[PDB]
């Protein structure tokens, strides 16, 4: 899955994110909503306007969730169990949306880490996000 090399990459790059994670999370969601509008069917109860506080607030939650997976990179399945259930059993979010959000995270980082966003970090981050997605949808159908 995630190689030692991959983990360093992720650790390092998310390392650079630091204090902006929350704001990068919100931006990522916004990009998501704009580039792939089908994703909003999941958030009919949200205000999706530009600068929407719900989004900003939501972006933070996602951001935190990723920091926590980074922090428990060796035990994602258990570190994310809860979220796995919410998404697969309560929200019942189709797996494809996960690929859409990941794509949009990568864009955000890309736009934000010119220096760090090398091919190898890009590959790592991709793999990583693939991993989180996989955990979040294991129990779905």
């Amino acid at each position: 899955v995630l190689s030692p090399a991959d983990k360093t990459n992720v650790k390092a790059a998310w390392g650079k994110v630091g204090a902006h994670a929350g704001e990068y999370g919100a931006e990522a969601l916004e990009r998501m909503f704009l580039s792939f509008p089908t994703t909003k069917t999941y958030f009919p109860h949200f205000d999706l306007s530009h600068g929407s506080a719900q989004v900003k607030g939501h972006g933070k939650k996602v951001a935190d969730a990723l920091t926590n997976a980074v922090a428990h990179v060796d035990d994602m399945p258990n570190a994310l169990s809860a979220l796995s259930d919410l998404h697969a059993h309560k929200l019942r979010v189709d797996p494809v949306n996960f690929k859409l959000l990941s794509h949009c995270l990568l864009v955000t980082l890309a736009a934000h880490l010119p220096a760090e966003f090398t091919p190898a970090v890009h590959a790592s981050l991709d793999k990583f996000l693939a991993s989180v997605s996989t955990v979040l949808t294991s129990k779905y159908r």
């Binding site: 916004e30 580039s35 890009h122």
Partner: protein, 146 residues
């Protein structure tokens, strides 16, 4: 491909700033690195064992250029992508046997490279417009598969 006047403009303004030699090498290069399965198509390109082997490979940069050039034509005929790409489409199907799924990959990677190059300039909406185009180009290249 519901490309509105404004998206159309958006798209075109920015493509004006792109250095195709450059972005094309990056784009094809990052594709072979992020999604290694695609390297099965370029067994003639020599060494693709590591990111440096790939990114600095002169054959990848050369090819990367060809590709972005075709892309450029497409942007010049946003109203006729199917016609514009009919022959490339038969090639990739008939001669190369490329699963068209790969076109989606290149399209996404290509968007990361734009974001990477343009930073702040690569805004959500601009991103929105470009996702339509790449989707459109991928559909256009997929159209003559049989």
């Amino acid at each position: 491909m519901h490309l509105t006047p404004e998206e159309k403009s958006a798209v075109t303004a920015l493509w004006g700033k792109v250095n195709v030699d450059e972005v094309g090498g990056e784009a094809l290069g990052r594709l072979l690195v992020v999604y290694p399965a695609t390297q099965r198509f370029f067994e003639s390109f020599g060494d693709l064992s590591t990111p440096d082997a790939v990114m600095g490979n002169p054959k990848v940069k050369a090819h990367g250029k060809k590709v972005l050039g075709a892309f450029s034509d497409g942007l010049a005929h946003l109203d006729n992508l199917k016609g514009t790409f009919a022959t490339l489409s038969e090639l990739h199907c008939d001669k190369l046997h490329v699963d068209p799924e790969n076109f989606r990959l290149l399209g996404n990677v290509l968007v990361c490279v734009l974001a990477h190059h343009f930073g702040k300039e690569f805004t959500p909406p601009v991103q929105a417009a470009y996702q339509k185009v790449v989707a459109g180009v991928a559909n256009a290249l997929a159209h003559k598969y049989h």
